[PDB]
Design a protein around this ligand. Sequence first.
Ligand code: ADP
Ligand code: ADP
Ligand code: ADP
Ligand code: MG
Ligand code: MG
Ligand code: MG
Lengths: 548, 541, 538
Amino acid sequence: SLRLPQNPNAGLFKQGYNSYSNADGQIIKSIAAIRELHQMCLTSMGPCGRNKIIVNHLGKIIITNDAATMLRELDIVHPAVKVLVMATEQQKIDMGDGTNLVMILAGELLNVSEKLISMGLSAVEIIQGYNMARKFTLKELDEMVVGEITDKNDKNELLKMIKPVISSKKYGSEDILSELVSEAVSHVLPVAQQAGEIPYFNVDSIRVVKIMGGSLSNSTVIKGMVFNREPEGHVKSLSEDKKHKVAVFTCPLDIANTETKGTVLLHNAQEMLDFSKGEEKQIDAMMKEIADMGVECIVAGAGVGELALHYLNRYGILVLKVPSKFELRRLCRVCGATPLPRLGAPTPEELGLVETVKTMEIGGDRVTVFKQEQGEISRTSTIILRGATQNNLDDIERAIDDGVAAVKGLMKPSGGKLLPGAGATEIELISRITKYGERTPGLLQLAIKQFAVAFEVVPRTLAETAGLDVNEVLPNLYAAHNVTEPGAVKTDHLYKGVDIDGESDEGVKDIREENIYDMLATKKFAINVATEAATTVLSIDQIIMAKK
Amino acid sequence: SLRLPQNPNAGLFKQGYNSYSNADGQIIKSIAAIRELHQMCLTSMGPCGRNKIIVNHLGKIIITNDAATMLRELDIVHPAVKVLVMATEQQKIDMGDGTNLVMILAGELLNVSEKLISMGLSAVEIIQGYNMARKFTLKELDEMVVGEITDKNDKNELLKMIKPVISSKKYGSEDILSELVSEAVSHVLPVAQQAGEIPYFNVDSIRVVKIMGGSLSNSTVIKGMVFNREPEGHVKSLSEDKKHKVAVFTCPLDIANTETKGTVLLHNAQEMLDFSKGEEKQIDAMMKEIADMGVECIVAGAGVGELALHYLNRYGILVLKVPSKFELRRLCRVCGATPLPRLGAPTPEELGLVETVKTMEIGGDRVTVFKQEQGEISRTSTIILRGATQNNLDDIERAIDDGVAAVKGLMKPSGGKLLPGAGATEIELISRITKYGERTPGLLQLAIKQFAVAFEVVPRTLAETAGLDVNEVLPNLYAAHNVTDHLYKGVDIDGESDEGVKDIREENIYDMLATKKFAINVATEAATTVLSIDQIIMAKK
Amino acid sequence: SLQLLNPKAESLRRDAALKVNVTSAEGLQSVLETNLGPKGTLKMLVDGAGNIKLTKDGKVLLTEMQIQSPTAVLIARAAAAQDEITGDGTTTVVCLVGELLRQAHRFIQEGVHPRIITDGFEIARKESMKFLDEFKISKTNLSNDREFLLQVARSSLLTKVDADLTEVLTPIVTDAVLSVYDAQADNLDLHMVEIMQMQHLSPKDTTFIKGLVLDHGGRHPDMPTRVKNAYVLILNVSLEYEKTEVNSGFFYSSADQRDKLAASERKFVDAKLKKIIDLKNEVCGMDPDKGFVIINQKGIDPMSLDVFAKHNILALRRAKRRNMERLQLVTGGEAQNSVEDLSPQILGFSGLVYQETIGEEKFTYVTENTDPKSCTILIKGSTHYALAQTKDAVRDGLRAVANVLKDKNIIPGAGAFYIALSRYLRSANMNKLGAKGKTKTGIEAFAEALLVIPKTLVKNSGFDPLDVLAMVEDELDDAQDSDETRYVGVDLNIGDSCDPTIEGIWDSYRVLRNAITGATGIASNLLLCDELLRAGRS
Ligand SMILES: Nc1ncnc2c1ncn2[C@@H]1O[C@H](COP(=O)(O)OP(=O)(O)O)[C@@H](O)[C@H]1O
Ligand SMILES: Nc1ncnc2c1ncn2[C@@H]1O[C@H](COP(=O)(O)OP(=O)(O)O)[C@@H](O)[C@H]1O
Ligand SMILES: Nc1ncnc2c1ncn2[C@@H]1O[C@H](COP(=O)(O)OP(=O)(O)O)[C@@H](O)[C@H]1O
Ligand SMILES: [Mg+2]
Ligand SMILES: [Mg+2]
Ligand SMILES: [Mg+2]
């Protein structure tokens, strides 16, 4: 009576092991645990979304509104939350787009599931309700698609793709951020129209260089790569033009050393007198063949000895240090060169072409300019990013990567397949699934009708973060979808969407004029990952933890 | 596999409770635990027994060979020992003799049961084996008594009763200690031609007053009582007054006051002058009637005021405090008076007679001597012990208390008779129990044969404490009973014990019949309880 | 969801608390099952103070040992209430509760809901009460035969001590009632017999006394110890004043009033003593062999002891409260408070009054009465636990012989009643069901759970309970077709059956009726409790 039996036969497992089952409201506590981190990403959704500050154990601060980036530094405890954390990371890797949608959609499916479980629906019937409704959802997305990108590169068409993607990440000015990204994409495209070749694109081609100081309006696009380096012998503006011939050596420049027990052997004083002048003639003979080929610049991958740097300054040859690997690998893609390990005379067919190499002060340090020109086009262009704070420079770099990942979506599928933006995609699916829930007899219609209710979070979040009442604005939007379709074709009511601030009362007319659209390839995997993320949580009847 | 399940019953009851049950322990295990205290009593048995020093938490040291006294001052955590401890306490309270026999006999009955349980004999049939063997033992003790005596009066008749008891305790003194008890019993018994109807006798008739210093041979017997007090007011008159009337007053001597708290209320100064002489003449009126009756001694248990002591000093009347009430009734039995709580005046029928009173120092401290010669005393006496150490005289007082306890056990029933000692009776009981098992076939024969084996510890303890071999003298003792003269064979303690046979009638060493009957019944029941407890339940601390 | 309310709150829900009720009851039963029967084990209770208590009854064991498990507390309070009214059945109820849970727990693992299990208990228990009326045998107590009371009283003592002490105590507990009876009024009280605790002789040497015995001895030596004819005067007033209600004091002007004010308090004492002395000589003066005895509930002035010593009057002080009612029934007198009204009619009578000195205390014995309406039992022992072990055996034997006079119907013992309920509860046909397949599950669990009593008796004897009960079912099958009514018992000697009526074993009506009803409620509430919660402010 004084002390409990304290769960007899609990010694079967260690004291750190705990058992949590769907019974005793733990499945409700798991859903309630999602709402703790769900509201964190709700205020970050949309162009008006609010960025968040997360301080790790090392002191590094990353300010971003991206749900996939924020969940990386956070330490997660509840097991089912890690299902939602790792679900948003896959969306950022695969499509590089729609990361905040997976976080919000998978969290709302569990919120509407709390009412489904309370009514007595078993975990098996709830899973079957979302799987049957998702298959109908993916089929309706292909029916509601409007327009296409058609040609790969265009000045105007790239403003209907990258611009609406970067509008949510560091909104700021529209045309300023869109022109910087759209310029670097046109350089890495092989073009070659009418040739019938298979298009190709690399997401790691475009590199963002973070340089503090200045302003965003002072940023520009550089066709070549930009590094922070100090030339050893001399700096040269290379105003003599006629371009240049450049060679890249992944191996360092120095006398070849034996990998085992390199040692100087001198038997008599006769060999010692010629040992000092012998090493000078070796580098002279090797570097003379390079200078005879007209090579004004040499890219090195490791430390170069001083004896080798002497003869390079004699013929006026620049010296570049390219540490590690990936930094040197993208240099040859600019000039179209093939590295070779030997120090001998390079092949003229493997030599690159760079017209000018400049060194100027940007952020207070000397940077080398690899920028290319109109002719002899180059690939893997870099974008100089100027900013006052380094925290803004980090997320804009990820904001540009979101626009670069959107270019990848123009390659694998048949086209761009633009979808109505401003939340009009998830709203139209509500009326279609509602009709689909009635067409299915049985008890499975409860999970299907509530599956469309979870799509109401997109219009409510965009309206709440915009400073508008969700009770006045949201029902007024259904008035366009409540009139269904008339006796005549050509219905433009599908372009209605949610507006930020301004005059409210729905607004922005038809979004076709606003030019903001969504990607179909992004919405395909965004719904599949978010559904499986909530399905995994609902499919687990018992959760076991260790040590805590 | 690192941690045990802890059992489900761990949550039941509490962690402080400990359990010892069948197959869980005990079962000749706990019997091996009492062997440590059993060996303690084996070395203290007999006249050659060894005394044991015990220091209580208070610091008082009690040196004695009595098992009932030793086990009383020892704090023992083992519960089943208390069954044997409380068994020895009954022997001291009722009979007062045989405490060492109860602890030794009951301890061996559990030792001989070690072989019985090892053979698969259940404890249910073991209890029935000792019960039927105990009934046959008590029935055979009557035919072995050659010491039936109808006297219980003459002093020489007590040499076969009191003296054998004193032979065991403080064996260094025989005729000195026996004369002190035998003379004290002769004083407390009334002188008459024939005294029947079992005259009353109690252990309060003989007392022991221990005085430090002096040899034990210098001790004597005093018919009165010896208390340590300070006389006041005058020196005694010796025999000049011859027999003097002694008045014992329960209430103190002073002007009678109410139980409630009073105070003096004086309205005028006329009563103040008479207040000084008022209290003087008020108490003097009650003290004057006492001197007219010839009362030379007044005993008031409570404190006597100085106003009452003033008058009694000039008339030559003795005053003695006697603070303790228990010793107050003892002085009344010396003179034969009636304690009077009232003051009044002494009546002739209620006053006693004391021959003489003197104040002397036996050991250097002044004590008052109540010794009365030629006078009539009823159930009162004392024994003054003289010794160099206090601890040695402690067991001597217990030896005297055990000597007078035999008189109480002899006088109260029809009689205690006598039994042959020095291992004579214990060997005869072996042949009786052994032959009794063969008369009735059954499974109880195993418990009957082992019941007679436990009787071998008493006769060999006398040989073991004498520095003798139990594999020679003891086996040769059974051959001496082969066949009156075969019932008198016993154990010999001496350098002449090599023959192993000494006649008991020479030294006249006898034991009481009623003592052995009461000792076996308690020892058998004590060993029966240990075997009848299947499960033990302990507690925290 | 409980920790959200309080951080320190703990609970076990559904089967988590269900395993506790089955385990805690089985663990408590496993300790007390070894005490069932005459061959049962003997427990030794040893506390921190060193007290030793030997008893086979579950009432003393559960009282001295505090139970930490909350589940076993319900069983302890149920066994305690069983000992209050019936004075017996502590071990029986404990063995039934733990068995009803284990038998029902086997069906719960099969998917049976505890609600329908509790239905099978109430339906089968009501059928057992109807069978209890037909199985019991009415007896005639107007003859007051000894042989019938000796066998019933012996059956209760065989479960306490061995057969040697049982045969001694059997006539004592049979004589425990005797002259206490009423034909019309039906009122029977066992609190009139007195339990004396003293160490004298041996525990097997105790005897029964036909009159009251008191623990107070003679305060004065001259008071005669033996009185042939004594008139008991009941005095509830205290002769010695302890205090005065109104605060007062004595103020004397002169020293001559000191002895006078002291004599002022002597008048009130002598005023109460004046009418007492006149009552003794009122009957007859100068009459030998006729004494006078006073038994007072309050204290008596030691100063007044000499007043009664001259008249040879025995006085007793500090009597118990329950002793006053017993003086009217034994001595035949009447309780009196003050001395203002006295008479020879209100004085009692005793044929023998004597006192014995045991140790340092003296006990008063009163016996030899004409028509005594009450008696006493002297319990003697050789040790401390001997007084507690014999007392628990007598008190449990008192309630056994009382139910015979309270209810003339006697039910045979030796597990004959539990075995008879087994075959009766197997098939209830269409009589009482209430549901299809729901009720029959609880009835089967209750029927097989009643067989634990005869099986536990055999386990304590060291035999096979399955082989003993096998021959019991074979005898009951041939007895139904032979047109002969037979009661088959369980013999623990040779491991065979027997007849409780021939062997002399019977059970009380109130013990078995309250055991089935009491154990059913405890086991039902534990099956209906799916959560064990602990909360509060420390
Ligand atoms: N100015 C705007 N007006 C209306 N809707 C907008 C506007 N800017 C963005 N949106 C909508 O807000 C949504 C935000 O998408 P988001 O979850 O931030 O994508 P990601 O997580 O890949 O950055 C977009 O789908 C877009 O349709
Ligand atoms: N001088 C002696 N010679 C031989 N035997 C003796 C002598 N003195 C004592 N004994 C024996 O030693 C035994 C001691 O027993 P004891 O412990 O006194 O018995 P109890 O416990 O009844 O007092 C006695 O039975 C006695 O026969
Ligand atoms: N000698 C015996 N033989 C067979 N059964 C007995 C015997 N004595 C008692 N019983 C059975 O044991 C049951 C319990 O008896 P008892 O031990 O006196 O009560 P409790 O178990 O409450 O202490 C009774 O119902 C009775 O049938
Ligand atoms: Mg976006
Ligand atoms: Mg002795
Ligand atoms: Mg009983």
